[PDB]
Subunit: 311 residues, 5 copies
Amino acid sequence: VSPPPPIADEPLTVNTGIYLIECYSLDDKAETFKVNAFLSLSWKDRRLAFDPVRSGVRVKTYEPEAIWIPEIRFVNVENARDADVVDISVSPDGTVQYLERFSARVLSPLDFRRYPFDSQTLHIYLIVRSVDTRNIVLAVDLEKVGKNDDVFLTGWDIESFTAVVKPANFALEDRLESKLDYQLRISRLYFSYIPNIILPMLFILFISWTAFWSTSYEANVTLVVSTLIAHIAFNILVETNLPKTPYMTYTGAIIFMIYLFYFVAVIEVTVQHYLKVESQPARAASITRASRIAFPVVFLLANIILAFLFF
Amino acid sequence: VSPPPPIADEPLTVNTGIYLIECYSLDDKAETFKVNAFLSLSWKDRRLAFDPVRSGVRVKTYEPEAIWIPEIRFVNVENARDADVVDISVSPDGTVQYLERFSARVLSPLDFRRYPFDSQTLHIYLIVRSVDTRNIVLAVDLEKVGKNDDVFLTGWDIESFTAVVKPANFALEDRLESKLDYQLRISRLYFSYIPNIILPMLFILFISWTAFWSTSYEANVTLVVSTLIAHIAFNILVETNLPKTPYMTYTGAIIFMIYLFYFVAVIEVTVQHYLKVESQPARAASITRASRIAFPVVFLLANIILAFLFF
Amino acid sequence: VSPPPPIADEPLTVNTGIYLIECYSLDDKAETFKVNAFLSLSWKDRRLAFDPVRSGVRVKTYEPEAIWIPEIRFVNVENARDADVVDISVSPDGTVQYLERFSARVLSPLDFRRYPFDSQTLHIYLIVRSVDTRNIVLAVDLEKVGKNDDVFLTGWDIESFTAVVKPANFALEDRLESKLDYQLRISRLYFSYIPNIILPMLFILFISWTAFWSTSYEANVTLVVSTLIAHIAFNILVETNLPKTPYMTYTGAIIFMIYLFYFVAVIEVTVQHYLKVESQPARAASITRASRIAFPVVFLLANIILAFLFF
Amino acid sequence: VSPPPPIADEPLTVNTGIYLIECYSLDDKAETFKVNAFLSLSWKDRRLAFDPVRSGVRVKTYEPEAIWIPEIRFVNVENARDADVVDISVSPDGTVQYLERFSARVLSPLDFRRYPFDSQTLHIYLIVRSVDTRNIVLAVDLEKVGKNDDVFLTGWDIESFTAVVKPANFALEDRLESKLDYQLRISRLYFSYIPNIILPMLFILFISWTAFWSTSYEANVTLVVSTLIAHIAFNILVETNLPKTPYMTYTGAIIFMIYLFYFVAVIEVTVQHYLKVESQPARAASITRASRIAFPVVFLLANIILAFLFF
Amino acid sequence: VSPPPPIADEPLTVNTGIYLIECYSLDDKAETFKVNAFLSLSWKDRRLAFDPVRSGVRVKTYEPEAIWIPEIRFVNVENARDADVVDISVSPDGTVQYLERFSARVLSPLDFRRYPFDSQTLHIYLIVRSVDTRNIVLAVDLEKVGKNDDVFLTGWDIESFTAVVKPANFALEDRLESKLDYQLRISRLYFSYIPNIILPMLFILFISWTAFWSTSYEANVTLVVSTLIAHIAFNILVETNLPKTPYMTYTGAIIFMIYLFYFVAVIEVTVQHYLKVESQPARAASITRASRIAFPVVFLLANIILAFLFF
Ligand SMILES: [Cl-]
Ligand SMILES: [Cl-]
Ligand SMILES: [Cl-]
Ligand SMILES: [Cl-]
Ligand SMILES: [Cl-]
């Protein structure tokens, strides 16, 4: 089977449409997401036209083998989609109505700089390589584009499944290629963030600060070092629930600052001691009393600057 | 092969039935479960009818190729099912008796808010896309719906495999679609919950409370901080056995409250000390003696409120 | 091709036999095991019979397409087996000698209640669905059932590959089905159990008991709490080597009791102190001296009761 | 279905070209990377030549079956590529223009000796086995070699996709084989290295050094041992983000030196004590005061030697 | 197509040869290794013989369909190999020259008793099941057996790819089977063993021994228990880099002995104290002074006995 010849110097337009049946398995690491959906295509193959009175039928159904179907592919798929033809329906003028059900692991990039307040746009790029006998351009049939209301992505809000109606046609390896963009907007919904990650991580840091209402260097050391280990222990626990990135996340910035607040604390404790040791206990208690208000206020301000810096 | 024409303006009813052979691989994370089962279908194709005395046979067996079979699919499957035709049997009136054996990873959502007392309902949605020449509606043949007594899901009680006899018919991409709901009820059976998760997590919290029958700030600090690290260490150990959710679980609420009870404890210990340090040892021991009854009773009440709040 | 007609009202018997070539990949979690083996089948198709003098041949070899072969399947397989026909040989009386080489992930349940002294029986269930024209019953040909001497399952002793010659025939979806049971007996061989898991877990518990030959509440606390953390640390280390179950294991029972022996220990230490603190040092040292013999003996007895309870 | 006969004794040159569509899944462990790309090939099969006036066509398009295509393979692929023919175009002189779209997991080795400053060269080796009737040599058509601007490898800078135009021809199993080298240059971009790995690992080491401005052997021990455990705890946390190699990495060298700086520290602390214990408190404080400048300066120099040694 | 008839009562010899292209993915756990290679076969089918002057050709190339090819398989493969025919060449005497490129996950057993000094022999078993019309024996063509110089197995030294020229012919399911053994010798090259695993594990054990140059039971307890936790912590870190076996490894024996050296140490510390407590400080310091030389020397000897015991 060969492409349908053009009556005039015109390209064939293939009216696309993707309906998400079930969208799942979003790999925050691999920047992948698996989607099970419907692809719909329509074009005019005048060779396939018929007289309905003579044929005794209003619409003829054909097997993929039997007729010409355009080589539609995806740019950002891992390996080729696991498609299965659902229906092929030729109207008496030659307007083929194709529908397939596919499932493919897509590769859209993810940004976690604002984690756990991050929001994504998941791309699904449709392409069609123009043949040597006639060029092919894509088009979005807005009716045949949608999503099932039951489509669920646990911990995310599935905002909208839209499509840039504008196909960015370009040249590749001395041939025209028509490219459509299907964008799936999702926004994070991490509820348990504060009780699971921040709130307990804050208490461990606060427990460390009880070393300013103490003067025992033996108690002070246990207090600061022990809480530091408790901090690292808890970080190991929330390793799962955290973004594993080559850049700095919003949450990653907070965690880092907390490591520093342990470091500064130890300095205070060591100073408070070395002053008392060197018999200057005025400046010793002056520094401890200061820290009481200093450490918290500074932390608050720092976390404000920090926050606004990302948002 | 074309669909069977109606006698009048009626739709074709396809009598479904799923028999679970072996149900396994329930991913508590991915909200998936793999199932190996039998799909049975029945409809009336009057073209296929015969006079048994003339044909000399009671039932004729046909190859899938040879006769018309309806395109039945699943909505919530990951990738297409690994089906295989077992038998096709046409009775003398045209009633085709189809049977296939399949295996597919299903996507039903899971709720762990009541963990480890949670109970699920696992959905398997059957669909059939109506042809352009006649519409198709589904039906449940209650007899052909069941499960093998040996079907095992370790740590769960497989309650019932039922089906909502009511097919929710709807319109999609300008065509009718009939949808059936097959629900598999499972309820958790986590026996070792108390000895594996709660009982050792309780002892570690109690060990921390022995700081109210002490007055040594050096011992008190070691006691509370060390048990806090022991708590976090044990949490890392039961990380496996716990639900990894964006919402709060019943168990997750208990764990959180325990983090707080360490925080409050440290405050007590710091207060008991700062009072003794500031030479007010009456209010110092008053607070320690109070906590002895306070901390436990409060914890008990809190865990009662907590419990009833989920149940 | 259609089934071989009976002489009279008798069923066709298909003589089975499975020879394990290589048995591997036993998932203690998923309760699966992968097996690469030979399936052999024999039945009498009198239509296929020949006069060897006329045909000039002793045995005729046929292609699977060419002749009738019974639909043999497995009940507890994950997805369909990766079979490949090795040989089909018809003797002059019609006795077909079929042989295929397959590979399938089986689903037999595992019991770890006696871990690491547990022993399993791995089931491979063979079925054959009776046709509408004649019923089919299975049979074991003891000669064609065996295993390669090189079949290895690391850490297990492959005891015996046997088969219950009795096929449990039953009714399913209005038809007879013959079911054979192929059992593979394996017994655990965990040598390094004592040096890897128990022996170091015992020392950590003993180190904690050196708090009865001490009177320093500062030393006593460090001793008990630190060893408790060491205990939990080591439990995290042997998490791999341990059974992850919703029930109680033999080993899991020991581990739990050890958590309790830390709890009781802390009570002793706190009591020894609170008595010395309240100036009753007779009952203080009496309790410490007692524990010296008490804690060990009690532990021994408890571990005896415990052991006999499972065995 | 036979190769094109040579005009003279010269070999057939097949003009190659790979265009990376989407490059992803770089396994730092398995030394693999998955790539989805276009392979383009061109050669002259004079048998396929035509007179365009007589044939009434400018360019003839053929099915892979219909014409001779050279057996092109990859050396370093895991399993065979998931290729799909996009277009085959024969010009009137016999110049075949082949294009396929493939996806294969490649096996290029990785070197992490300079981690996280490492830079790789990812090899994709193209081969063609010379037939018994005529030899085949490869060639790079620089125009048909490139990459999509959107090709992303998270945490890496995709420098250049080049090809050594020189095909290294050699003999294998008594036949000529032409081998082309496609090199993909990538350089690491680990931004968060200092805040995620080094900076907190440095603070923990510094906290340990506060034992030189102390004289309490009880505090000194807690200080050094606790930080050592905090060190090991943090190493467990950054286990993910680190190279798991049988050789020494740059980072691995730093980590090792840090383990040693804890060891030397403990010696100091033990010495400072044993001197004070043996009533030689001049050499006791002399050693502590020394370490104050010693430990840091030595560490700095050591890390300089260390650094220059890899770079 | 049927097998080539013999001249007399002789068997057909098929000259084998495997050339490793890329050998990778060695699972130390699953005892598997994936290999991408060339399989070459040669036999004499006198039916296929030709007169080169009449045929006008030196060598004729045939499609797998067209001529008879022997059913060669592997014994220790997981699932069937992903083979692809590269070339079939018949010389004028009937000597067929077959070549295929395959990729299969092999199952050879591994021994880690001498870890990280272990050395393996990786088996690839070739078999051919003799037909009912003529028997088939295998043979090694030493020329067609080899490996690519670039074949890499990270952390191992690929010593030699050899083959036992002696095919172990045997009877299975009433038929002859010829079995060839292809052995791949590999020896471990774990360079970073000492700096990554032993050297830091030694320091942690030595840090514990600084309790013999101390008399503070409070310091002594912290010292020994803390280092024990540091030991367990480091063991968790090197869990990756270690062999997960049901038997005892060389390394596993060292680790165990170290657990014991902590146990003995605690006893010393407890004794040194209980003697000083019972006012016998001569035997108290005598035991501490002894241990100073005892513990190290004993450890050295023990590690010598230990070492020689495995080697
Ligand atoms: Cl695609
Ligand atoms: Cl489906
Ligand atoms: Cl099966
Ligand atoms: Cl390839
Ligand atoms: Cl094979």
